Ligand binder design. Structure first.
Ligand SMILES: [Cl-]
Ligand SMILES: [Cl-]
Lengths: 223, 223
């Protein structure tokens, strides 16, 4: 048990092809993928919550079907977002946000009253954070923590998830051995990698992970 | 601006009276209502297309007009479709639909050749989906994705929309102050609520909003 989520996150982070994205973008793993490696969701959730509380990771709302939470290392996010904002007009607002707000508040989102009254942000500074892509509107009174450049990641991720699921759907009886899937040529549209995508499919229960005497069989869950 | 359509959907979702259908139906909001909260239709349409592609929402065609799009959370669709299916003979067909079709694309409709060849459905399984209310006929060769029990929603919605327009039409010179309309108690025929309906009328441009020294005046369009 101890270190299960931490080990899973580091294993999944190593799969991330960071060279595809904006310099601002830290490697992202999905809570769904952690569940592939730590299938006890109670354990996975408790240890991710501990890492969140101990400052080490940020949870980000990305809004996918099934598990829509991204996981990033806080220090990776901060380093890249700071470098990226250097000598842009939103740099001052972003520096204050990273230095004051992130350590004070571990939530996925921030309230307007919190930002303006507790932290002393001007509306124009909040607008800068939205322009920088560090905040996105959640509702009339709050903003999601966001990752600059995540739009490209979300686009690549959704197209790749559908393409990998299609590999299983196209196979005889809508099932495919893991070794057969991973040994296939990655379609052009799968930019984040087959293994990266398979962990998401297993954790999101878009495929069933069946133990056979031929190894792991991925099966569409039609029953 | 980023997240505007998603934030509008979350705000409108809170207006839905779930207790009206005993949570047999997933909460439904309308693209017209999103236009009330996101009046740049170009931005609203671009962001709704992104959310559709990402799969946290499903867009559903509703037949009362060309561009009547319903908006539901995919997890609410799955939860309600599964509750509705529980111990019914179309359960097998519906499970295959949710596992194979739903995650493949955000499409509003499916061609016959798509259903049989891509998704492996037998006609008997398609008949089950029509009986379940998960598909409705679009034309001789295709089906709309549909929400089980949406018939009752459509009936309440059409009668409510016309009842609220009738309140304005019956008023002197076919215009009524917004505060006066909202300060009415909803006649039994307006089952989805006045505010829910007023956002649809504003967004769909079925009323014109006129600025006056008495507040916003709703005026019926005389073309
Ligand atoms: Cl790389
Ligand atoms: Cl209103």
């Amino acid at each position: 048990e101890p270190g299960s989520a931490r080990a899973a996150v580091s294993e999944l982070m190593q799969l991330f092809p960071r060279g595809l994205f904006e310099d601002a973008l830290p490697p992202i793993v999905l809570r769904s993928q952690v569940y592939s490696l730590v299938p006890d969701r109670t354990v996975a959730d408790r240890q991710l919550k501990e890492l969140q509380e101990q400052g080490e990771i940020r949870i980000v709302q990305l809004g996918f079907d099934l598990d829509a939470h991204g996981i990033i290392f806080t220090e990776d996010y901060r380093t890249r977002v700071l470098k990226a904002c250097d000598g842009r007009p939103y740099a001052g607002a972003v520096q204050k946000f990273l230095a004051s707000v992130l350590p004070a508040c571990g939530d996925l989102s921030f309230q307007q009253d919190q930002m303006t009254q507790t932290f002393g942000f001007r509306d124009s500074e909040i607008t800068h954070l939205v322009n920088a892509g560090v905040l996105t509107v959640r509702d009339a009174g709050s903003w999601w923590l966001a990752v600059p450049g995540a739009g490209r990641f979300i686009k690549y991720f959704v197209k790749g998830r559908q393409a990998v699921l299609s590999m299983v759907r196209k196979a005889k009886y809508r099932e495919l051995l893991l070794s057969e899937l991973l040994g296939r040529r990655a379609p052009v549209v799968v930019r984040l990698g087959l293994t990266y995508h398979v962990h998401d499919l297993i954790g999101a229960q878009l495929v069933d992970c069946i133990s056979t005497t031929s190894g792991t069989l991925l099966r569409l869950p039609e029953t």
